[PDB]
Design a protein around this nucleic acid. Structure first.
Lengths: 222, 169, 159, 292, 124
RNA sequence: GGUUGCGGCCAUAUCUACCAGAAAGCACCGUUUCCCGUCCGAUCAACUGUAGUUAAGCUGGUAAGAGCCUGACCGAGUAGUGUAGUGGGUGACCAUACGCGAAACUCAGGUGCUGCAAUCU
RNA sequence: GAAAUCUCCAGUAGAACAAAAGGGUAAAAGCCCCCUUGAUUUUGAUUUUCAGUGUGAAUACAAACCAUGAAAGUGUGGCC
RNA sequence: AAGCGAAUGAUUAGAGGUUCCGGGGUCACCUUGACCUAUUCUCAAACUUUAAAUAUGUAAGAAGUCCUUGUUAC
């Protein structure tokens, strides 16, 4: 069947209806890959973190995320190469939209009842977003900043509503502000773990804290 | 060191398998009755797999447990067939170990007719005095780590007894 | 169709609290209930024999009957334009004493106590409670406490 | 073995006296609950316990904030009554059973009546309420976690208490000397248990057969040179002695409880403070990072 | 695994003594069939086989089995100087290696080298 | 102040590692005549407190311990929400006025407390 | 042999509780074992649906007689 | 509302660790097929630790409080 226009399912009209054992017969989401670019770079390689944040409360159709993801990748890749960035599609397609299946054939009024038992069958998936929630997060080196904003600008155009390109003060995908993460990385409380980093807590078994973070204890002692 | 931290023989369990039921369980039970001097029990199959002709609660296994000086003695006479030597395998991480033989009918006593030949299995269950703390009805607790049994203590305990060496292979 | 069974819509009213499942603490059967006591109803779901209906959970009423293992509680009920009287067969596992009434009772002993001394000296001992009166005047000094000014903070994304 | 946080975070620990295993709350609900038409009439529990080298029997009423004890007659007090060697056998349980009976009856003002059984043949004779007299003190046996089994020591105390006049509801099924063909307790066999005949017959049969076991064991007996048939005498003498004066007195004691506390405090391991807790981590952080 | 309820003896030769003797003295206690074989003359047919065995035995210490040697001469006898060693025996394919034990002593070599795959009938 | 029997609140008590335990007590522990029970005196039952013994159990302590329990002007007066507006906004929703006001997070603590009885260097 | 039976350790319940789902349950409401018929009689009161009618179902009792348990107690059908 | 470095259900990305219950490549041989652990993203009407606002039960006495001692087959 022809895909219904996104104008119909724009708003958060219905309560969440996710894939569960009560929601059995549903198709799969169009978006499957959520992390793109040089996704396995360490945290320091990509200091700057940019977010594409929705300013309104609507539903992002699952495939609209896939549609914007290919566009955001494609400008970014061809401008600064394959591995100059790492974009993460934060929000996920869990809300399963419903379609009431209809017959529009000649004289379909006979074979179909209209609104009797009009509970809709699953039509697709969409991502529920509220105001201020991040849609896209790209992390890259700071000189790449013009490219990622423009690349995010092209991705904004696949989304309904208004979205904002905000230059987050955090150090990449971390939860730490730039000047004070530098203090933390310098003091040596940070071990990479493939793509993200480990923090040393003031609480814990000191022997394990020593196992993971020998450099902190050496740095203080020295 | 401390006398009752030393390992001691606590229970030896002896089991077999007989897929079907009938007169084969009589001989498979009279072999243990003559051997251990005490009647065993016929454990009933918890499930049916149908890959063995076994139905539920079919009494497909005969097993007995022996403890005390008889248990050591039957083990003493049960390691002659094992040459008082053993493999590094067969040792559980909890300090128990075992082995299986294939005949004890005319190995134990003179063969009598209509008893046949059956393979017999041993599982030595060793731990130290004080094991009642996890078996008493009242104030049931646990045992300290120093009081636990590992592979290290039992293999060492298996050296000075039987003049046995482990990892024969 | 539609169901209105004896215990419908009780997915969470008869759940035992977190880490509070299992045995009821033994003080429950030890509390003594006398006819006239004011008790509330909180049906611990663990005990299935003698549960109240889900309407009475939280409803506080007097005890009119005391039985071997149960007590009889009177609860007023909203039915149309009138309150009805509902006498309930309640196992003591589902009830506890109301702490509201005992607060009033201990106050009565406090009122009687201070009225007793008022009989000797100090007439007009002001029995009745007083709500929070408007606060009286006071002097607010500034020794070491100069009023430090504040300014509204500029908007920052903080993200 | 290396549990996760989720297990520890959602773990519902049972009540402390169940974690230690000493208390069975399933029975305690139906031993401490009261017919509410009997509002403030505490239910008395004949608590019997078996430590090693002693017997502990008590009368306990469960109040709101805990359990108060009417009288607690342990078995390590039988030496003052006459029985010295052997403080756990079946006869010892019966003797302390009658002791805890007479102690509380003499305490609640019912000594003059309810004399229990004077001449004890071990018959199932429950103390019937005397006409125009206060009802017999009804206590309820609470064995605890021990197993009900025919010829058990805990039911030895039970028969001892009821035979002491303290009317405790029970039945003859679990008394020793039980017959599965006829539902009767053998008077000859049961009274033998009362006077410790089972111990006595074991001794004299050991002496008949061997000497080593009879000597290695019962070497408390050997010091006083008491015959196996002399056990009945000392038990019957103590039974009358218990009837004579069960009022009890606490032991004389040495080093008053203040000295008890003072000496125990030094050897008892004390607990550190937060500053000390923060002090020693500096030593550990220095040791584990001091040019390591 | 050598010492059991009773140490096996061959023709009155104890198990420990069964580990000692050479080739020549075994003909006294050997059956006629193998005795006739040696009587007619063992002319260096096992010697080249027999020397490499001692090389393998010495090179292999305890904690592990000796290296599997191999041959084809099904007609060879079990001789005490092959004792405690494993050899594969040719049969056409896929040499089958057998440890040589004192209870194996004095028999032929071709009773292990099953040259034909046993015939299986039925559903399988 | 320790121990035991019975407990009240039911992790501040739980859990995982290590250390310590004078006296008493607890327990481990020793043996199967009787009772009783089990494939098995391992459970239970009986009997000796005797052969020993802190190795356990148990109790206490230790851990920048997890957890759990408190607080905090830490988050946060945030989210949310009751009321009102001929408030803004195409709408989505949002701000405001009068109120109430979290949770996660972070930090700072703590790791059982008692009740009856007996007992203990 | 992944899966025949045995043994041990960890095992907050991730199993089972006739049957839909939910709630509830650890010396148990689960598995095994012993005894039993209370799944009985007389009625009445009470709760839910509600007109505070009936039916249904259920709670507490009393008078009885029984069952079990050592007893407390539990049991007037199925844990609800 | 909030929560998943908390239970069940989902879920994206990686990082570190295996019995002869699979190395598929030289016999125990690096050997890409696991699950487990410490993280990371996003969720839930038929999930939840926790948990509002509003609404909601009761009480705020003289039919009560205190003292003395009479009835009862309970």
């Amino acid at each position: 069947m022809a895909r219904r226009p996104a104008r119909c399912y724009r708003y958060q009209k219905n309560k969440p209806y996710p894939k569960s054992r009560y929601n059995r017969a549903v198709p799969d989401s169009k978006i499957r890959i959520y992390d793109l670019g040089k996704k396995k770079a360490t945290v320091d390689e990509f200091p700057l973190c940019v977010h594409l944040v929705s300013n309104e409360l609507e539903q992002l159709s699952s495939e609209a995320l896939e549609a914007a993801r290919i566009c955001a990748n494609k400008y970014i890749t061809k401008t600064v190469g394959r591995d100059a960035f790492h974009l993460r599609v934060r929000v996920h397609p869990f809300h399963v939209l419903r379609i009431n299946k209809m017959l529009s054939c000649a004289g379909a009024d006979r074979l179909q009842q209209g609104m009797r038992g009009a509970w809709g069958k699953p039509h697709g998936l969409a991502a529920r977003v509220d105001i201020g929630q991040i849609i896209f997060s790209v992390r890259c080196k700071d000189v790449n900043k013009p490219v990622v904003i423009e690349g995010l600008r092209r991705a904004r155009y696949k989304f309904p509503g208004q979205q904002k390109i905000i230059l987050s003060k955090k150090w990449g995908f971390t939860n730490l502000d730039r000047p004070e993460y530098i203090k933390k990385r310098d003091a040596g409380e940070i071990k990479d773990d493939g793509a993200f980093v480990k923090f040393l807590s003031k609480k814990g078994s000191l022997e394990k804290n020593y196992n993971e973070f020998p450099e902190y204890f050496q740095n203080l002692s020295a | 060191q401390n006398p009752m931290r030393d390992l001691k023989i606590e229970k030896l369990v002896l089991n077999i398998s007989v897929g079907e039921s009938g007169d084969r369980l009589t001989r498979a039970s009279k072999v243990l009755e003559q051997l251990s001097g005490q009647t065993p029990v016929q454990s009933k199959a918890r499930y049916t797999v149908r890959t063995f002709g076994i139905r539920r609660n079919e009494k497909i296994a005969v097993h007995v447990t022996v403890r005390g000086p008889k248990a050591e003695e039957i083990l003493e006479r049960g390691l002659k067939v094992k040459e008082y030597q053993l493999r590094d395998r067969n040792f559980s991480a909890t300090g128990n170990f075992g082995f299986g033989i294939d005949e004890h009918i005319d190995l134990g006593i003179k063969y009598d007719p209509s008893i046949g030949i059956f393979g017999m299995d041993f599982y030595v269950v060793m731990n130290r005095p004080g094991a009642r703390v996890t078996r008493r009805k009242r104030c049931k607790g646990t045992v300290g780590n120093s009081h636990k049994t590992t592979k290290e203590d039992t293999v060492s305990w298996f050296k000075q007894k039987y003049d046995a060496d482990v990892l024969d292979k | 169709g539609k169901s209105h069974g004896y215990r419908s819509r009780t997915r969470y009213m008869f759940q035992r609290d977190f880490r509070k499942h299992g045995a009821v603490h033994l003080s429950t059967y030890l509390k003594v209930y006398k006819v006239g006591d004011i008790v509330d109803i909180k049906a611990n779901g663990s005990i299935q024999k003698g549960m109240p209906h889900k309407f009475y959970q939280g409803k506080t009423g007097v005890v009119y009957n005391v039985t071997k293992s149960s007590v009889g509680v009177i609860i007023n009920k909203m039915v149309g334009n009138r309150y009805l009287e509902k006498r309930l067969n309640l196992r003591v596992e589902h009830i506890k004493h109301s702490k509201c009434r005992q607060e009033f009772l201990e106050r009565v002993k406090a009122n009687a106590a201070k009225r007793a001394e008022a009989k000797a000296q100090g007439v007009a001992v002001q029995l009745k409670r007083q709500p929070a009166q408007p606060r009286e005047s006071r002097i607010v000094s500034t020794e070491g406490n100069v009023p430090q000014t504040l300014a509204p903070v500029p908007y920052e994304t903080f993200i | 073995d290396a549990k996760s946080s989720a297990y520890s975070s959602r773990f519902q620990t049972p009540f402390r006296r169940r974690r230690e295993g000493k208390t069975d709350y399933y029975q305690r609900k139906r031993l401490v609950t009261q017919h509410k038409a009997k509002y403030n009439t505490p239910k008395y529990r004949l608590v019997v316990r078996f430590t090693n080298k002693d017997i502990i029997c008590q009368i306990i009423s469960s109040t709101i904030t805990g359990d108060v004890v009417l009288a607690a007659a342990y078995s390590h007090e039988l030496p003052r009554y006459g029985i010295t060697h052997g403080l756990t056998n079946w006869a010892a349980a019966y003797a302390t059973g009658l002791l805890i009976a007479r102690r509380t009856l003499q305490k609640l003002g019912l000594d003059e009546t309810y004399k229990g059984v004077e001449e004890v043949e071990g018959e199932y004779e429950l103390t019937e309420a005397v006409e125009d007299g206060p009802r017999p003190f009804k206590v309820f046996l609470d064995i605890g976690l021990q197993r009900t089994t025919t010829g058990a020591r805990v039911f030895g105390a039970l028969k001892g208490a009821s035979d002491g006049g303290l009317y405790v509801p029970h039945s003859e099924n679990r008394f020793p000397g039980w017959d599965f063909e006829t539902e009767e307790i053998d008077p000859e066999l049961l009274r033998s248990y009362i006077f410790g005949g089972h111990v006595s017959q074991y001794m004299e049969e050991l002496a008949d057969d061997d000497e080593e076991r009879f000597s290695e064991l019962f070497k408390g007996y050997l010091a006083d040179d008491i015959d196996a048939d002399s056990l009945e005498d000392i038990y019957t003498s103590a039974h009358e002695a218990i009837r004579a004066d069960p009022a009890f007195k606490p032991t004389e004691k040495k080093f008053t409880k203040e000295q008890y506390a003072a000496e125990s405090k030094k050897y008892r391991q004390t607990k550190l403070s937060k500053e000390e807790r923060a002090a020693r981590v500096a030593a550990k952080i220095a040791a584990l990072a001091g040019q390591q | 695994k050598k010492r059991v309820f009773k140490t096996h003896s061959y023709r009155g030769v104890d198990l420990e003594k069964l580990l000692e003797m050479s080739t020549e003295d075994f003909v006294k206690l050997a059956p006629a069939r193998v005795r006739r074989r040696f009587a007619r003359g063992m002319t260096s047919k096992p010697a080249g086989f027999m020397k490499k065995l001692r090389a393998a035995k010495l090179a292999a210490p305890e904690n592990e089995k000796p290296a599997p040697v191999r041959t084809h001469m099904r007609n060879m006898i079990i001789v005490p100087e092959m004792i405690g060693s494993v050899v594969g025996i040719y049969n056409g394919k896929a040499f089958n290696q057998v440890e040589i034990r004192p209870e194996m002593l004095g028999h032929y070599l071709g009773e292990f080298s099953i040259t034909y795959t046993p015939v299986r009938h039925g559903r399988a």
